[PDB]
Design a binder for this molecule. Structure first.
Ligand SMILES: [Zn+2]
Ligand SMILES: [Zn+2]
Length: 93
């Protein structure tokens, strides 16, 4: 099974979306996982399926909101290792 995607970058495009790009693990499908950020409670994260591309615009997000972005390759047992999280805030505030 593959390791984590390499050289991940993420930057907001507008108040509702983020352009995520990466290089393959050291694979035709990936997941992008986006989690909105005193007891460690979290709302439901977003997941995006990506096929046959090494970048993707994740959309439908909340304005003025911090998101943790991770990418994973898809494998026979589920996701491979996730890239180290990138925290980015959408504009709109
Ligand atoms: Zn996944
Ligand atoms: Zn999937």
């Amino acid at each position: 099974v593959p390791g984590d995607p390499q050289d991940v970058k993420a930057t907001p495009l507008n108040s509702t979306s983020i352009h995520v790009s990466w290089k393959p693990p050291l694979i035709r499908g990936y997941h992008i996982h986006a989690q909105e950020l005193g007891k460690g409670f979290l709302n439901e994260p977003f997941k995006f399926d990506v096929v046959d591309t090494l970048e993707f615009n994740v959309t439908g997000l909340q304005p003025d909101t911090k998101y943790s972005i991770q990418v994973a390759a898809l494998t026979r047992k589920g996701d491979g290792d996730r890239s180290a999280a990138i925290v980015v805030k959408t504009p709109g505030g």
